[PDB]
Amino acid sequence: SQRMLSFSDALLSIIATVMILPVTHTEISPEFDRSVQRLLATRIAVYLMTFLIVTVAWAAHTRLFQVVGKTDDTLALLNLACMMTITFLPYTFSLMVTFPDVPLGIFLFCVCVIAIGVVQALIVGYAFHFPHLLSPQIQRSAHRALYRRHVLGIVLQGPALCFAAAIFSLFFPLSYLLMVTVILLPYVSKVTGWCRDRVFSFDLHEPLSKERVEAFSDGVYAIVATLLILDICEDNVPDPKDVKERSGSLVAALSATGPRFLAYFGSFATVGLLWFAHHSLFLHVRKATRAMGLLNTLSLAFVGGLPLAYQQTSADELERVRVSCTIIFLASIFQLAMWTTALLHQAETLQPSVWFGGREHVLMFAKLALYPCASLLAFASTCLLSRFSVGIFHLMQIAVPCAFLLLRLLVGLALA
Amino acid sequence: SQRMLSFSDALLSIIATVMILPVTHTEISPEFDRSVQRLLATRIAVYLMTFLIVTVAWAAHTRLFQVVGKTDDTLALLNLACMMTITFLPYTFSLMVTFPDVPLGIFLFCVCVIAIGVVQALIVGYAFHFPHLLSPQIQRSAHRALYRRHVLGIVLQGPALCFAAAIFSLFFPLSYLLMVTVILLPYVSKVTGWCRDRVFSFDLHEPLSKERVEAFSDGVYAIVATLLILDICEDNVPDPKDVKERSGSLVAALSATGPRFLAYFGSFATVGLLWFAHHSLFLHVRKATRAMGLLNTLSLAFVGGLPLAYQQTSADELERVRVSCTIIFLASIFQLAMWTTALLHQAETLQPSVWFGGREHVLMFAKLALYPCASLLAFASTCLLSRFSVGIFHLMQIAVPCAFLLLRLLVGLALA
């Protein structure tokens, strides 16, 4: 009844992160640094916007399926169609980006989004056609029943805007920006600008379920961790024709991939550590608020960029680590931002054990703040020349959590 | 306490399917068909053996974490280390395959497996050092407590064999087959050959938990479905420098990727339909037996190959569909095999709603057997020349489950 959601967002993870592939697959070797840097920046921007749009579409989808509590075979088929459409998103986005002036690209992206909208429209129509079967709960069923007239709008207002943008494409298309409204309307507008009412249970932009965001984050963490060690594998086979390469001695020609091997090692270590922080935190969240997921999206966005950082590290250029440092910091600090959200609702979120002055509050606090502090140290490394020591530092990084249940005891020793 | 398992097997899904990448990324165009076919066969065999070994490692891991009911931060860190080690499996396997005569490759594969062995040994040692904390249940805690002395063996007998095989490579490695025993020992040997006892709760080769195998299958289904879409996307951007290709008219250069576009468009439908069958079935399984997961592994193995089939379809060569038909059949028939295991334990597995003569037993039966029957009807193309008709039938294929809940009503009309 709910596993379909698990398959859905597991697919959506991998979809979101698809655009990270050309980032890693670029050639950092200057065998032209200005133009290749500009191309890498373009690809990074495309990936970031892609993750953002796939994430907001995923949020719309999970909200919709939260307003649909049960599941039918036909419902599952419609969800599969919706998944296919939303899957087609990143390609359309990249196409529209690398061809902004041609109306065909924007038209393709817009037909993609109106398609991902109309299938959800059929989904909610099916739902409201079978109340006793697919309504979430009693209040979702026993109510004014106008929720459809309401929720339809929320599912339709997004794509409908595209409609106008659609007709604006080849009309004569300076604006071209209504798509951005599709992002901004459901996030803040209904919260601030104007809502529609006339007992109520909104379910319009209610906070995501902890399990759904949790599964999505786990999916993306995995697909980055395995994203690295999966290009080495498919691209670093010693090529048995290597009899000419290196003598024989396979170890010789194997040590050539050593740099990117250690790169994958460190990247997986850092990604797994970040996931461990994320899992320890989200194990203690009681009801993940909207701001929580909002911050989580950005944290995941930078975690996705992390492999490019770790590849740049193991490639006056001693500034590379600097870059590959900030990403880590970013990929952690927004996470820490979530941790600095207990003050928003200690009673509703962050179940009492982790409250200010809780049984292990300092423990969780330092376990989350450990990576931003380490990245800040490797950043301030700038003060000297032996900055490439960052590696051993991050080494010591992973050495902390094992003894960290005891290292916090040191702060306990600070009782006197 | 359990989500760590979800992240673990979500990671292991991708880690299993990594070796599918060079299969798709080959060049089917004969711009040498004998040698390229031999290379594709080598890659397919490598992928199949890779999925098998990663699957048996995942089975060992999930059994272990089933005999470890709770979780600790240190335990999660050890699990992350185990995940990195088992992640290193497919590369070592491919290396050993493409270099069987050199002892370095087999030694690398063997150190890779002894690593995941020893880290799991530390895991179970930690577990048995904290009974009240990390033992699964009362019987797992209040017992003869020799389970360690037992379970250690099961976790160590696999890698330890490699140990011998290891040295068998270095000194002077015709056997090279003890690794195969590492696969065959935990599956059947302890079941048939010799077990060790002296109240008992085996937890040695107990049937996998339904949720774990279910999540692994969902992960792999998502990753193949999106696997085709990663290729189109990273590799089919219309490269604005295409101003030489075609005039402008982006639709022109876009229609060049049309073939593989439709290829993905159909492959995703097929994979999603297979997953829908899988989800409908596994929604009704009460306690997935060992044979159930055993069949599920092979079904997933062929589902993983499915994209090569769908790519070969949209590439006298009509017989290609033949190939891309059988795979589907395979990728479904083992599925149906799992369904035919209802007779094994109707009371224990396959909760009574779907029993022989149940409320919707015929419904589930047909929903599972639809794809093998359709693939057989397409295979019957050998009787005529209009074979590619399969496509439209495959189209009709996806159109069937939508009306399924009513098409089985025809059987009701067959009451007279």
Neighbours of A100 (CB within 10 A): 11
**Three-state SS at B205:** coil
- Mutation target to probe the B interface, by most B beta carbons within 10 A, among A11, A82, A228 is A11
What is the Cα–Cα distance from A159 to A297, expressed in whole angstroms? Answer: 22
Distance from CA of A379 to the nearest CA of B (A): 26
> Are the beta carbons of B250 and A280 separated by less than 8 Å?
no
Query: Which residues are within 8 A (CB) of B258 and not within 5 positions of it... i.e. 6 or more apart?
Result: none
Q: Which residue has the tokens 């909104």?
A: A202
CA distance to A58, A271, B59, B107, B150, per residue, from B156 (Å) = 43, 29, 14, 18, 10
> Are the beta carbons of B234 and A401 separated by less than 8 Å?
no
CB-count exposure of residue B73 (10 Å: 0-12, 13-18, 19+):
middle
Neighbours of B344 (CB within 10 A): 12
Helix H or strand E segment including B19? none
**Three-state SS at B398:** helix
> Are the beta carbons of A95 and B237 separated by less than 8 Å?
yes
Distance from CA of A396 to the nearest CA of B (A): 14
Q: How many CA atoms are closer than 13 Å to the CA of B315, on its beta-carbon side?
A: 20
Question: Where do the DSSP E strands lie in A40-146?
Answer: none
Distance from CA of B191 to the nearest CA of A (A): 32
- Out of B232, B275, B404, the one facing A91 most closely (by C-beta) is B232
Query: Which residues are within 8 A (CB) of A129 and not within 5 positions of it... i.e. 6 or more apart?
Result: none
Q: Is the torsion defined by CA of A128, A132, A137, A139 positive or negative?
A: positive
Which token pair is A6?
């698990």
**Which residues of chain A does B80 touch, with a Cβ-Cβ cutoff of 8 Å?**
272-273, 276
Question: Are A334 and A304 spatial neighbours (Cβ–Cβ below 8 Å)?
Answer: no
> Are the beta carbons of A14 and B88 separated by less than 8 Å?
no
Which one, of A366, A362, A370, lies nearest residue A397 by Cα?
A370
Which one, of A84, A231, A116, A47, lies nearest residue B264 by Cα?
A84
- Out of A232, A240, A279, the one facing B3 most closely (by C-beta) is A279
**Which residues of chain B does A265 touch, with a Cβ-Cβ cutoff of 8 Å?**
84
Q: How many CA atoms are closer than 13 Å to the CA of B69, on its beta-carbon side?
A: 13
Residue B120, Cα to own-chain centre: how many angstroms?
A: 22
Q: What is the CA radius of gyration of chain A?
A: 24
Angstrom resolution of this structure: 3.4
**Which residues of chain B does A236 touch, with a Cβ-Cβ cutoff of 8 Å?**
91
Residue A350, Cα to own-chain centre: how many angstroms?
A: 22
> Are the beta carbons of A3 and B214 separated by less than 8 Å?
yes
Alpha helices in B314-360 (DSSP H): 319-339
**Which residues of chain A does B218 touch, with a Cβ-Cβ cutoff of 8 Å?**
3, 6-7, 10
Question: Are A267 and A310 spatial neighbours (Cβ–Cβ below 8 Å)?
Answer: yes
What is the Cα–Cα distance from A127 to A144, expressed in whole angstroms? Answer: 16
> Are the beta carbons of A22 and B234 separated by less than 8 Å?
yes
Distance from CA of B83 to the nearest CA of A (A): 9
For chain A, first and last CA: distance in Å?
55
Distance from CA of A266 to the nearest CA of B (A): 11
CB-count exposure of residue A352 (10 Å: 0-12, 13-18, 19+):
exposed
CA distance to A61, A114, A154, A210, B161, per residue, from A163 (Å) = 20, 7, 15, 33, 65
- Mutation target to probe the B interface, by most B beta carbons within 10 A, among A25, A80, A112 is A80
Question: Are A75 and A68 spatial neighbours (Cβ–Cβ below 8 Å)?
Answer: yes
Which one, of B109, B108, B115, B107, lies nearest residue B169 by Cα?
B107
Indicate the residue type of A36.
V
CB-count exposure of residue B9 (10 Å: 0-12, 13-18, 19+):
buried
A109-113's contacts with Cβ under 8 Å and 24+ in sequence apart are A109/A179, A110/A162, A110/A163, A110/A165, A110/A166, A110/A169, A110/A179, A111/A166, A112/A85, A112/A88, A113/A57, A113/A89, A113/A158, A113/A159, A113/A162, A113/A179, A113/A182
Query: Which residues are within 8 A (CB) of A181 and not within 5 positions of it... i.e. 6 or more apart?
Result: A161
Query: Which residues are within 8 A (CB) of A227 and not within 5 positions of it... i.e. 6 or more apart?
Result: A17, A20, A21, A24, A307
Residue B152's region, left for phi above 0, alpha for psi from -120 to 50, else beta, is alpha
Q: After which residues is chain A broken (C to N over 2.5 A)?
A: 31, 172, 198, 246, 315
What is the Cα–Cα distance from A67 to A61, expressed in whole angstroms? Answer: 10
**Which residues of chain B does A102 touch, with a Cβ-Cβ cutoff of 8 Å?**
248, 250
Q: How many CA atoms are closer than 13 Å to the CA of B262, on its beta-carbon side?
A: 12
CB-count exposure of residue A361 (10 Å: 0-12, 13-18, 19+):
middle
Question: Are A273 and A294 spatial neighbours (Cβ–Cβ below 8 Å)?
Answer: no
Distance from CA of B167 to the nearest CA of A (A): 18
b/e for A111-121, b at 16 or more Cβ within 10 A?
A: bbbbbbbbbbe
**Three-state SS at B36:** helix
Which token pair is B246?
């075609």
Method of structure determination: cryo-EM
C-alpha angle A303-B95-B220 in degrees, rounded to nearest 5 = 50
Question: Are A105 and B240 spatial neighbours (Cβ–Cβ below 8 Å)?
Answer: no
**Three-state SS at A217:** helix
Which one, of A295, A416, A122, A166, lies nearest residue B402 by Cα?
A122
> Are the beta carbons of B275 and A15 separated by less than 8 Å?
no
CA distance to A79, A157, B228, per residue, from A116 (Å) = 10, 12, 19
Length of chain B: 416
What is the Cα–Cα distance from A21 to A46, expressed in whole angstroms? Answer: 11
Question: Are A224 and A17 spatial neighbours (Cβ–Cβ below 8 Å)?
Answer: yes
> Are the beta carbons of B14 and A401 separated by less than 8 Å?
no
Phi, psi angle pair for B61, to nearest 5°: -65, -45
Distance from CA of A102 to the nearest CA of B (A): 8
A409-413's contacts with Cβ under 8 Å and 24+ in sequence apart are A411/A362, A411/A366
